[PDB]
Design goal:
Fe cation binds at residues 127, 129, 188. With 226 residues, the protein is of the alpha+beta class. It is built from six helices and twelve strands. It has helices at 8-23, 34-49, 56-60, 81-97, 150-153, 207-211; strands spanning 25-28, 54-55, 69-73, 106-109, 112-118, 122-127, 136-143, 157-159, 168-170, 177-181, 188-193, 196-206. Strands 1, 2, 3, 4, 5, 7, 10 and 12 form an eight-stranded antiparallel beta sheet that branches. Strands 6-11-8-9 form a four-stranded antiparallel beta sheet, with no helix packed on it. Helix 1 (8-23) crosses helix 4. It is globular, with a radius of gyration of 17 Å. The two termini are 30 Å apart. The structure holds 2-oxoglutaric acid and fe (ii) ion. Residues 127, 129, 188 line the site of fe (ii) ion (FE2). Residues 115, 124, 129, 141, 157, 172, 188, 190, 199 line the site of 2-oxoglutaric acid.
Length: 226
């Protein structure tokens, strides 16, 4: 009634850029609205019911690392149009930011990794997303879990910013967008989840680090949506 969305340019330049450059972590709640976030949840639940997910441990393994299942979504597939819209919304924010996030020049991204922690106390041990300079500079995560209560269901993303006297507890709440630097500045872990936990991750590529990267689906650079 009295509420209005912030335009992407404003959110980007007045909040995301300052917050990232000071803290290396930035949370945006109510990113897309209830209607759209509910539609994303249905599409992700469809992918799961219909059996499109692959054990994350298979992807990462050579010791148990991660209890999640996953699938990569390009954005344009049948029953994935709203994930496509999500990805375009993320892209619009980054475009407005680009130039002003450290000295990175972002020239692309991965496809969307839709991930599912199927309850049963599953999670992801402490890790750095990009420890060996594979080109990914920013991790962007969108959560879609209605009425999530970490007291009961756990599933917290805990981030340990390198050499800071602080840490961050990020709850995977419905319609929350999360940005953090993908490198060693931000080791993090998904703590045990006791309900079904959904999340959609995209990583953004720095043009320079990417070009110099040494010889997965994490390695494909798509152009940003217009
Ligand atoms: O779902 C999350 O909160 C983070 C998952 C994660 O860190 C990863 O899959 O690399
Ligand atoms: Fe991660």
């Amino acid at each position: 009634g009295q509420t209005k969305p912030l335009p992407a340019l404003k959110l980007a330049l007045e909040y995301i850029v300052p917050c990232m450059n000071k803290h290396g972590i930035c949370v945006v709640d109510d990113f897309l609205g209830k209607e759209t976030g509910q539609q994303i949840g249905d599409e992700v639940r469809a992918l799961h019911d219909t059996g499109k997910f692959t054990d994350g441990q298979l992807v990462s393994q050579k010791k148990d690392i991660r209890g999640d299942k996953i699938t990569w979504i390009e954005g344009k597939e049948p029953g994935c149009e709203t994930i496509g819209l999500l990805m375009s919304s993320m892209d619009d924010l980054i475009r407005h930011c680009n130039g002003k996030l450290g000295s990175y020049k972002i020239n692309g991204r991965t496809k969307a990794m839709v991930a599912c922690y199927p309850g049963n106390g599953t999670g992801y041990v402490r890790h750095v997303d990009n420890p060996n300079g594979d080109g990914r500079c920013v991790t962007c995560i969108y959560y879609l879990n209605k009425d999530w209560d970490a007291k009961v269901s756990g599933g917290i993303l805990r981030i340990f910013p390198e050499g800071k006297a602080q840490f961050a507890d990020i709850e995977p709440k419905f319609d929350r967008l999360l940005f953090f630097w993908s490198d060693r500045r931000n080791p993090h872990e998904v703590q045990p989840a006791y309900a079904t936990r959904y999340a959609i991750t995209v990583w953004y590529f720095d043009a320079d680090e990417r070009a110099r990267a040494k010889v997965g689906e994490k390695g494909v650079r798509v152009e940003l949506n217009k």
